[PDB]
């Protein structure tokens, strides 16, 4: 308790991670005010699983995790339990029994550029699907054919990551959105993250 | 089994046009987002365009917007990339892509634009 939880450091970070290299911040030993985030004018998505979003301040958890990254607007719906697609399968995966909330907002004026922003990447090729909450930052050449690649990008030898090329004149579904996933963890230890009072 | 086959590439003069096609098998094109990428030797793979039937239906890389148009013929299960006002910087192998439980990308079609 005592001090309010440092959610501002997560939501107001100037730089956000690429989804393949998604960031995680642990939140503990603090008073969490979720209602002020939910009630704000700030987000276009605030969707919860296993909890009611309007009673978040009434709840207590052992730890909270805050994962953050940038993806396309029309990819935000892959950030949910039970989804498939290149993001849910190769980049960031939620478990079926996810308890938590997914928060997103359009970041076109920060993360798109005239001429294209190439800084944000996603994984386009992978041998198998990620486990829930798994991260893969490898850049091994993906062997698509029968011939081995020996670390050289080339014919049937794919570099596994891809730049989004976010550019501001596409419709919102292809504009960048910043995403924060709050995972609510309840172990067999006392709760250290509760709402106010 | 899912397959994509790109056609239509060739050698063109700058300012000319080409119509690329992506013939899809194993899934309905209207049920999946389909994308064009391009890559020149020794250069990074570049996202070119996308088409789907929900949310924002089409999108383009900044440098091809206004010159390229992506479209879809459900009956022929094919996606097209009409490329107008071609420039030497458009020279590349062009690939069609879909995600159907996993990533699928074609063998590509070569586009060369002389100055």
């Amino acid at each position: 308790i005592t001090n309010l939880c440092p959610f501002g450091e997560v939501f107001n970070a100037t730089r956000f991670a690429s989804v393949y290299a998604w960031n995680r911040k642990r939140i503990s030993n603090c008073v969490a005010d979720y209602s002020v985030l939910y009630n704000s004018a700030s987000f276009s998505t605030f969707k919860c699983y296993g909890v009611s979003p309007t009673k978040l301040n009434d709840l207590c958890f052992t730890n909270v995790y805050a994962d953050s990254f940038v993806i396309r607007g029309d990819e935000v719906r892959q950030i949910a339990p039970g989804q498939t697609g290149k993001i849910a399968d190769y980049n960031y995966k939620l478990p079926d029994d996810f308890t938590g909330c997914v928060i997103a907002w359009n970041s076109n004026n920060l993360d798109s550029k005239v001429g294209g922003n190439y800084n944000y990447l996603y994984r386009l090729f992978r041998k198998s699907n990620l486990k829930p909450f798994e991260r893969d930052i490898s850049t091994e050449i993906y062997q698509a054919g029968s011939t081995p690649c020996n670390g050289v990008e080339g014919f049937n030898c794919y570099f596994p990551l891809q730049s989004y090329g976010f550019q501001p004149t596409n419709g919102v579904g292809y504009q960048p959105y910043r995403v924060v996933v709050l995972s609510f963890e309840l172990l067999h230890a006392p709760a250290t993250v509760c709402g106010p009072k | 089994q899912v397959q994509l086959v790109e056609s239509g590439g060739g050698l063109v003069q700058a300012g000319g046009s080409l119509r690329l096609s992506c013939a899809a098998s194993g899934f309905p094109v209207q049920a999946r987002e389909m994308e064009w990428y391009r890559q020149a030797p020794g250069k990074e793979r570049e996202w070119v365009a996308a088409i789907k039937s929900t949310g924002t239906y089409t999108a383009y890389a900044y440098s091809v917007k206004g010159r390229f148009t992506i479209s879809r013929d459900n009956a022929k299960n094919t996606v097209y990339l009409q490329m107008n006002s071609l420039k030497p910087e458009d020279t590349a192998v062009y690939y069609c892509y879909v995600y159907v439980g996993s990533s699928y990308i074609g063998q590509g079609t070569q586009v060369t634009v002389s100055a």
């Epitope: 605030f46 969707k47 309007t54 719906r77 | 929900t54």
Partner: nanobody
Framework: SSQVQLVESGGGSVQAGGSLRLSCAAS????????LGWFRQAPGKEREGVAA????????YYADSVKGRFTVSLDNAKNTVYLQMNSLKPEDTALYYC??????????????????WGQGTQVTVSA
Amino acid sequence: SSQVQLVESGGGSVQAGGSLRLSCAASGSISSITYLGWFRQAPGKEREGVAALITVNGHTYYADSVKGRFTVSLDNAKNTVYLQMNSLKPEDTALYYCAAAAWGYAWPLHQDDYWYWGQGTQVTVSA
């Protein structure tokens, strides 16, 4: 399911430039409703979001095509949400659905999220 029940009314036929007002009355587990959406669908086309309202604060969202013409509002006393449709045009012709959600809010609307659905009311705008 039937946890939240939505009944629409107010649709009909109008000439281009006219106005309509759709109503959607909610019953059942109404305290759980976090979000009210108006969708529309013409046959063979996408069921697309038109407008939405967040119940905790009354914040509203509108599709670009209807901004300045449509207004969504909520009467909490009657538990009824309204879509006022002004300056109608043939392009607005569709079956309009009211929908209610309890998991928070998400804009743009997507019909594959878990929604409680009204039965739909037809709007037909003639040139």
